[PDB]
Design a protein around this ligand. Structure first.
Ligand SMILES: O[C@@H]1[C@@H](O)[C@H](O)OC[C@H]1O
Ligand SMILES: O[C@@H]1[C@@H](O)[C@H](O)OC[C@H]1O
Ligand SMILES: [Ca+2]
Ligand SMILES: [Ca+2]
Ligand SMILES: [Ca+2]
Length: 474
C-alpha cells in the first residue's frame, strides 16, 4: 500500500512471539508521554539507524487514588500519544502502548486501567502498527498473580476485564498480557501457567486455549540466566511471549538468548531527550555494547548491525571451556579458518578480495591453505600488515586465561589481540620458526570479562601463518 505504515504484527509460525509484516521480530527502545511531551520526530527517527523497528510507549501513569476527588483520570496525554502514533506510523515503526506506574511499580488500579482502555482501545484500533500491552508491572513482582496472597491481589481479574474491553473495540489488535517484572526459572513458568490457565478459562472457555493474537509480556529483572529458563519453559508449554523491559545499558546476554529463542524485545533505554534510565543513542548504553559483543540481527532499516555470524559451531557463539578437577569440559580450540562470516571490513579485513590459497572458504577473502601441522585441516596464510580476523566467543567466567596462537613464520612477526574491542595483549612479538609449516605455540596470559565478545586478531606485520587459537582458564 501507498503508506510507510506497518501491517499487523502477527504470531510467527513457531508461535514464539509477534513478528512484523516482514516476518522479523520487533526490536526497540522506549519513550514516555506520562508527564512529558512526545519525543520529537527526528529523535524517534534515529531508532531506525540503530537497527530497531519498534517503540515501547509508557503512555500514561496510573493514579492510585482514582476515582477520588483530585485524582487524574486516564486520557490526559491524548495529544502527546497521538503524536507518537502518527510519528511511528510515518516512520514505518511498530508501537507498543502500555500503562506506566511512576512510583508505584508492582501495583495497579483496576478501575483506572479499565477506563484507560475504554478510551484508547477504540482510538487506535485501526492503526495496524500499534499493539496494546495491558499494564506495566501490575503486581510485586511476578507470577502467580492468581494467588490470593499476590501483592496486590486480583490482577488476573483486571487482565480479563481489560482484555474484553480491548477486544470489544479493537478486535484485530495484538494484546500483550501480564507484563511480569520478575520472570525466572522453571518455577516462574509454572506460576505463569497458573495465571494463563485462569485467564484462558474466563476469556476463552478452556484453560488450554491456543492464542491467535496474544502473548505474554515479561521483563528481565530475574536476570538473564533465570529469565532464559522461564522463557524456554513457557515456549515449550505453547504460549508465545514478548520481552517489554530489561537492562543490564543493553543486557547483551539476555538479548543473545531472546534472539536465539525467537522472542521480540523492547530494551529499557530511552529515545532522547529524556527518560528515567539511560539514553539509547549513547554508544556506551547500546551500540558499543552490540558492536563489541558481535551481536547481530537483520535490521528493517539501514545496514547496522552488519550481517554476520559464527562460522561453524551451529552458529552459536563459541563458549569457553572450564576445568573440573584436572580436565577440560569442552574444546578450547578455535580454528583460525573459522573466523566470523560477514565480509571484508566487517568480520575480517584482507588486502586481496580473492582467497589466494583457494581452500575451505574459497568465496571469502581470507587466504586459506591445507596445513601439515599436527591434526591437519587448514591454516590462514598470506597474512599482511593491517589484516584482521574476528571470532565471536562467550567467556563463561571472568578472570585470567591462557591465550595461545599456533603460528609459523620464516621470519619475525607481530600481532595484537582484542576482546570486545579492548586490547588484552599489547604488541606480541612472534619470533621466526624458520618455516611457514614449522609450527610453534605462542602463549600469553590475558584477563577477560565474562560474556559475549569478539576476539580480534590484528596482524601488526605479515610473515606468519595461523592454524588455531586456544583459550583456557588459568
Ligand atoms: O512510569 C514508568 C514506570 O512504570 C517504569 O518503571 O519505567 C518507565 C516509567 O516512565
Ligand atoms: O603464508 C605463506 C605465504 O606468505 C607464502 O608466500 O605462501 C605460503 C604461505 O604459507
Ligand atoms: Ca585474500
Ligand atoms: Ca591475506
Ligand atoms: Ca586450522
Amino acid at each position: 500500500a501507498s503508506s510507510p505504515q506497518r501491517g499487523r504484527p502477527r504470531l510467527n509460525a513457531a508461535r514464539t512471539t509477534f513478528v512484523g509484516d516482514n516476518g522479523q521480530p520487533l526490536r526497540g527502545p522506549y519513550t514516555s508521554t506520562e508527564w512529558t511531551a512526545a519525543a520529537p520526530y527526528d529523535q524517534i527517527a534515529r531508532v531506525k539507524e540503530l537497527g530497531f523497528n519498534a517503540v515501547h510507549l509508557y503512555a500514561e501513569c496510573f493514579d492510585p487514588r482514582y476515582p477520588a476527588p483530585g485524582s487524574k483520570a486516564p486520557g490526559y496525554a491524548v495529544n502527546e500519544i497521538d503524536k507518537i502514533v502518527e510519528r511511528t506510523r510515518e516512520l514505518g515503526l511498530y508501537l507498543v502502548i502500555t500503562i506506566g506506574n511512576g512510583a508505584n511499580n508492582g501495583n495497579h488500579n483496576a478501575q483506572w486501567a479499565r477506563d484507560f482502555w475504554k478510551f484508547y482501545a477504540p482510538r487506535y484500533a485501526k492503526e495496524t502498527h500499534v499493539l496494546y500491552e495491558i499494564h506495566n508491572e501490575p503486581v510485586a513482582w511476578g507470577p502467580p498473580y492468581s494467588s490470593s496472597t499476590a501483592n496486590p491481589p486480583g490482577a488476573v481479574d483486571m487482565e480479563i476485564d481489560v482484555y474484553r474491553i480491548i477486544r470489544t473495540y479493537a478486535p484485530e489488535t495484538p494484546v500483550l498480557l501480564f507484563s511480569y517484572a520478575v520472570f525466572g526459572g522453571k518455577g516462574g513458568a509454572a506460576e505463569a501457567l497458573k495465571d494463563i490457565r485462569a485467564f484462558n478459562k474466563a476469556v476463552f472457555g478452556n484453560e488450554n486455549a491456543v492464542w491467535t493474537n496474544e502473548a505474554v509480556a515479561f521483563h528481565g529483572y530475574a536476570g538473564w540466566q533465570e529469565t532464559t529458563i522461564a522463557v524456554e519453559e513457557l515456549l515449550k508449554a505453547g504460549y508465545p511471549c514478548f520481552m517489554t523491559e530489561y537492562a543490564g545499558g543493553l543486557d547483551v546476554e539476555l538479548t543473545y538468548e531472546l534472539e536465539r529463542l525467537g522472542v521480540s524485545w523492547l530494551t529499557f533505554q530511552y529515545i532522547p531527550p529524556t527518560g528515567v534510565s539511560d539514553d539509547v543513542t549513547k554508544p556506551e548504553y547500546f551500540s558499543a555494547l552490540v558492536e563489541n559483543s558481535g551481536l547481530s540481527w537483520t535490521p528493517d532499516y539501514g545496514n547496522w548491525p552488519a550481517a554476520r555470524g559464527v562460522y561453524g559451531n551451529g552458529g552459536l557463539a563459541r563458549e569457553t571451556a572450564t576445568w573440573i578437577n584436572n580436565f577440560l569440559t569442552g574444546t578450547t580450540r578455535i580454528e583460525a579458518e573459522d573466523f566470523d562470516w560477514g565480509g571484508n571490513g566487517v568480520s575480517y579485513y584482507d588486502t586481496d578480495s580473492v582467497n589466494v590459497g583457494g581452500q575451505y572458504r574459497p568465496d571469502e577473502g581470507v587466504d586459506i591453505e591445507k596445513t601439515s601441522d599436527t591434526g591437519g585441516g587448514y591454516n590462514v596464510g598470506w597474512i599482511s600488515e593491517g589484516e584482521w580476523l574476528e571470532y565471536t566467543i562467550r567467556v563463561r567466567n571472568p578472570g585470567y586465561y591462557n591465550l595461545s596462537l599456533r603460528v609459523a613464520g620464516i621470519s619475525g612477526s607481530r600481532v595484537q589481540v582484542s576482546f570486545g574491542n579492548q586490547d588484552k595483549t599489547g604488541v606480541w612479538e612472534l619470533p621466526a620458526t624458520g618455516g611457514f609449516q614449522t609450527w610453534t605455540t605462542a602463549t600469553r596470559q590475558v584477563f577477560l570479562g565474562a560474556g559475549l565478545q569478539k576476539l580480534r586478531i590484528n596482524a601488526l606485520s605479515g610473515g606468519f601463518n595461523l592454524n588455531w587459537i586456544e583459550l583456557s582458564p588459568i
